[PDB]
Paper text:
In Bacillus subtilis, the RicA (YmcA), RicF (YlbF), and RicT (YaaT) proteins accelerate the phosphorylation of the transcription factor Spo0A, contributing to genetic competence, sporulation, and biofilm formation, and are also essential for the correct maturation of several protein-encoding and riboswitch RNAs. These proteins form a stable complex (RicAFT) that carries two [4Fe-4S]+2 clusters. We show here that the complex is a 1:1:1 heterotrimer, and we present the X-ray crystal structures of a RicAF heterotetramer and of a RicA dimer.
Each RicA protomer contains five α-helices, and dimerization is mediated by intermolecular contacts between helices α1, α2, and α5, forming a core antiparallel helical bundle that buries 1,887 Å2 of surface area. Outside this region, in each RicA protomer, helices α3 and α4 together form flaps that extend in a nearly orthogonal direction from the helical bundle core. The elution volume of RicA in SEC is consistent with it being a dimer (32.04 kDa). Despite the fact that RicA and RicF have only about 20% sequence identity, their monomeric structures as well as the structures of RicA and RicAF are nearly identical. In fact, superposition of RicA dimer and of RicAF revealed a root mean square deviation (RMSD) value for 166 aligned Cα of 0.982 Å. The most poorly aligned portions of these structures occurred in the α3-α4 flaps, suggesting that there may be some flexibility in the turns connecting α3 to α4 and α4 to α5. RicA can exist in complex with itself to form a homodimer or with RicF to form a tetramer. Using Pisa analysis, we have identified buried residues at the RicA-RicA and RicA-RicF interfaces, which we conservatively define as those with >20% buried surface area. Of 36 buried RicA residues in RicA-RicA, 28 are also buried in RicA-RicF. Because there is no evidence for a RicA tetramer, it would appear that the association of RicA with itself precludes tetramerization and, indeed, the tetramerization interface between RicAF dimers involves only RicA-RicF contacts (rather than RicA-RicA or RicF-RicF contacts).
Numbering used by the authors:
A (entry chain A), B (entry chain A): 1 to 122
Write the structure that this text describes.
């Protein structure tokens, strides 16, 4: 008889989220994230970036656009460097596993809902 | 002890999908879709569009690009007309309710997974 309400759907979505939080994928992400916070080269580059971001806000505000563009290029060069660090590559692989899982859930749900609608139209 | 596997997550995602299929939102979509298939003006416009789409493939293949562009404009004019029909507006409102529900589920899951990761980093 009774149709599920949106509160019922959302409550079960929070149950699914808690199960996703207890996966090897989210486990690997948590472990990969803890390693980046213990890497000296990561520390150095993030701190250079943060100092530059500080100069960038100043330069934007005084309309020193040429100097701003040099600062933004240097931020882009440091961001590129960060991505080459193997603890950062491992963290990116772990982020991709979590995002791939959420995407598989959404697609699974979307496809099955669409399927059940199509079969109902007869 | 044991972490959920991706099969476990996906099986529960299919359980969530079946609950979404038994909502007032999906109920309204199914009822709104059945009405469009019983509307004479919808029938007439969809059949004009389909005939034009047939001419369009021909004209594209012979590289009659000027005539193709007239045919594509007429398809666009008929598509606009379809959207003004109140059974089509009702169907669009119902499609938006279903899509809004799936989006609320994905965001609910995404936010809660992110939240639980942030709280774990301490
Ligand atoms: Cl399917
Ligand atoms: Cl939150």
């Amino acid at each position: 008889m009774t149709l599920y309400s949106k509160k019922d759907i959302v409550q079960q979505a929070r149950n699914l989220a808690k199960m996703i939080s207890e996966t090897e994928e989210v486990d690997f992400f948590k472990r990969a994230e803890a390693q980046i916070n213990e890497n000296d080269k990561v520390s150095t580059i993030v701190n250079q970036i943060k100092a530059l971001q500080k100069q960038a806000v100043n330069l934007k505000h005084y309309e020193k656009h040429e100097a701003l563009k040099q600062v933004e290029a240097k931020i882009d060069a440091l961001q590129e460097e960060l991505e080459e660090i193997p603890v950062i590559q491992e963290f990116r692989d772990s982020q991709m596993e979590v995002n791939d899982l959420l995407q598989l859930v959404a697609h699974t749900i979307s496809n099955q809902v669409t399927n059940e609608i199509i079969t109902s139209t007869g």
